[PDB]
């Protein structure tokens, strides 16, 4: 159908330049202008401006004139947002959205502007853990940057009784955890595995929860 597909999340240092792509399909790209929106961490949507897709003529909001550039490749059904000389406060999720009155949104592109380096997590098994009716196990995902991490149990096979907790910053680095509740007559004879993926650092870790 109609979709707007944005490029993936990015880590840049203050001072660098990002280009973020917004790819449309499902309609004649040149009939409908494209908006850009900023969602800063926390609450709030803010309109950055728009670009007329048939003439490539952009219009910027007052607070977005200077460091920001809208462009297109028509040519590709792609609009781009370039942000130059990145500062801390460019940290946000960026959306493209079609139509003057706005209707369809892209899925968003998160930008992290940080001088903190890409760092893989360590994954620790949390066992109760060894010897009622119910057992709760968990997984600790410590010291990674940037977001996100993907955490499944077994391989998605356990979805019931799972709570994955939002990551919190623990001195420059993220920590996340996950718990899973299973019948006591399951564990430790059926193996339970925490699968952690950190796409930024290309880390894939499986950690088996062993009774202590």
């Amino acid at each position: 159908q109609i979709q707007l597909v944005q490029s993936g999340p990015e880590l840049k240092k203050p001072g660098e330049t990002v280009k973020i792509s917004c790819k449309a399909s499902g309609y004649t790209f040149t009939n409908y202008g494209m908006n850009w929106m900023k969602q800063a961490p926390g609450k709030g949507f803010k309109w950055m401006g728009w670009i007329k897709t048939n003439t490539g003529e952009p219009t910027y909001a007052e607070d977005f004139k200077g460091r920001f550039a809208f462009s297109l490749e028509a040519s590709a059904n792609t609009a781009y947002l370039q942000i130059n000389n990145l500062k801390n406060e460019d940290t946000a999720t960026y959306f493209c959205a079609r139509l003057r009155a706005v209707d369809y949104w892209g899925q968003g592109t998160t930008l992290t502007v940080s001088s903190a380096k890409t760092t893989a997590p360590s994954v620790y098994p949390l066992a109760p853990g060894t010897a009622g009716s119910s057992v709760t196990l968990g997984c600790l995902v410590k010291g990674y940057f940037p977001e996100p991490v993907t955490l499944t149990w077994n391989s998605g096979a356990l979805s019931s009784g799972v709570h994955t907790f939002p990551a919190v910053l623990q001195s420059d680095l993220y920590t996340l955890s996950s718990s899973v509740t299973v019948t006591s007559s399951t564990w430790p004879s059926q193996s339970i595995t925490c699968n952690v993926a950190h796409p930024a650092s290309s880390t894939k870790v499986d950690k088996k929860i062993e009774p202590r």
Partner: peptide, 11 residues
Amino acid sequence: TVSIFPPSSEQ
């Protein structure tokens, strides 16, 4: 429902 976990050996 509250549960508590000591550090793993590996940490």
